[PDB]
């Protein structure tokens, strides 16, 4: 069901990050992991503008009540094989917002996450390490 011609997406992933109520600390790290000092285009990643194209979602922020259907709505429209990488210490159970009537924490109880990266916020090398680890999982899953 994963058939065979998908070794190539391990050499060309396209990303699209889904903000749901962050405080813009990790969104800088998504953007600054593509500038000339921490360069990432040499692997092939390419910030794309619509969820039809992409195959790695890149969810940040604690899931705020108003943005709860949107996260469940943009998960169908990405096509097949795709992974989900959760970045930060607020998809992993909130950080300081674990006790609100508005933030339903960890992102695992909404959609099936694959790789978590702790930190607040993570340095941009940790994001590269996370995407390499998830991509070698999906290379294992092919064979």
């Amino acid at each position: 069901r994963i058939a065979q011609l998908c070794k190539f997406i391990g050499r060309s992933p396209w990303v699209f990050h889904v903000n749901s109520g962050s405080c813009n600390g990790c969104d800088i790290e998504i953007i600054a992991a593509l500038t000339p000092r921490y360069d990432a285009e040499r692997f092939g990643v390419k910030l794309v503008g619509s969820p039809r194209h992409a195959d790695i979602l890149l969810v940040t922020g604690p899931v705020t009540n108003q943005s709860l259907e949107r996260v469940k709505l943009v998960y169908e429209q990405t096509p097949d094989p795709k992974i989900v990488i959760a970045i930060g210490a607020c998809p992993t159970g909130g950080s300081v917002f674990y006790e609100s009537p508005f933030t339903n924490a960890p992102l695992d109880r909404i959609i099936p996450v694959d790789v978590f990266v702790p930190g607040c916020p993570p340095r941009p090398e940790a994001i590269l390490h996370g995407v390499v680890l998830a991509l070698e999982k999906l290379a294992k899953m092919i064979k």
């Binding site: 050499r11 360069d39 040499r42 503008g49 619509s50 194209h53 429209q77 096509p79 094989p81």
Partner: protein
């Protein structure tokens, strides 16, 4: 007749190899111009295969043209390859065959707009009425230049007038001192048309900007996206081949059954040198403009220079 099928298959396979490789060299040069390693050279030959890999999505409100316009686009590009000057005179070039070229170079973009607009949600409806305004606005600028040069190379004598096989007989550059000014005015209008047809630079309007970065092709998702990203690259090669055919064809004579391929390589090198200025430099050096400012520039500072060039070159013969 059957010897006109072998060329149409083999030249298609050649151009489909070369065009993506030129795109890869272009992305490498643009990456090095701003302190970056950049992707490896044959990077589009992976992106093509992974776009053919995935699962195509059809929306619930979609016509029979959503699944059938990215066939007709590639079909009228492959059928256009048989009329283009690849360095040797083309295969099906008869006495007409300029208006067939202009018609089929117009018609592919209309198939693209009809394929985008034939869907549901009105991001495609706003991303299509911005397309056809720029389509109408950029094709009286090339018709005057090409009709003036095709009329003017027919005074000194040829047997297939108004045909692209007649453009290797005699060029602009031997009409005397006044033609040297029409040469640079015509270099201006042809570089402007070539930048505004493949849509990069100032004129990067209906591709990666639907109100921010949504684009026109916000909807095509699987196989269809791979076919469209192939067809636009073949059209990139075709338009620049026209530009190097009109401006300066200087090929070798070299009779034999292998002078064809030597002239083919020399034409490929001239295509590379013409893209290297326009696409790479003009993309790196200048951002977008607008749509209401991209219309009043092609009717004021490009179409005017075509009239000046055509009138001044008419006063040379």
């Amino acid at each position: 007749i059957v010897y006109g099928v072998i060329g149409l298959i083999l030249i298609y396979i050649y151009v489909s190899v070369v065009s993506l490789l030129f795109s890869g060299i272009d992305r490498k040069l643009v990456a090095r111009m701003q302190r970056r390693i950049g992707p490896p050279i044959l990077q589009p030959f992976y992106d093509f295969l992974k776009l053919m890999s995935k699962e195509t999505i059809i929306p619930k409100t979609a016509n029979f043209m959503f699944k059938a316009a990215p066939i007709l686009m590639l079909a009228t590009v492959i059928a256009l390859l048989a009329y283009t000057p690849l360095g040797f005179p083309p295969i099906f070039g008869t006495k007409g065959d300029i208006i067939v070229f202009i018609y089929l170079l117009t018609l592919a973009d209309f198939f693209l707009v009809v394929g985008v607009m034939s869907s549901g949600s009105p991001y495609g409806r706003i991303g299509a009425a911005r397309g056809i305004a720029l389509l109408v606005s950029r094709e009286p600028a090339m018709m005057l230049g090409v009709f003036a040069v095709m009329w003017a190379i027919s005074k000194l004598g040829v047997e297939k007038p108004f045909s692209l096989s007649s453009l290797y007989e005699h060029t602009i550059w031997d009409f005397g001192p006044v033609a040297w000014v029409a040469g640079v005015v015509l270099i201006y209008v042809f570089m402007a048309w070539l930048a505004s047809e493949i849509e990069v630079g100032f004129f990067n309007i209906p591709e990666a900007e639907q109100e921010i970065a949504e684009g026109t092709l916000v909807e095509y998702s699987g196989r269809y996206l791979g076919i469209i990203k192939l067809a636009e690259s073949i059209k990139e090669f075709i338009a620049a081949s026209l530009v190097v055919a009109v401006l300066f064809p200087w090929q070798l004579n070299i009779p034999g059954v292998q002078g064809y391929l030597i002239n083919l390589l020399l034409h490929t090198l001239k295509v590379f040198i013409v893209l290297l200025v326009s696409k790479t430099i003009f993309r790196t050096i200048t951002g977008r403009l607008k749509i209401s400012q991209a219309v009043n520039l092609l009717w004021t500072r490009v179409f005017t220079a075509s009239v000046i060039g055509a009138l001044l070159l008419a006063l040379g013969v």
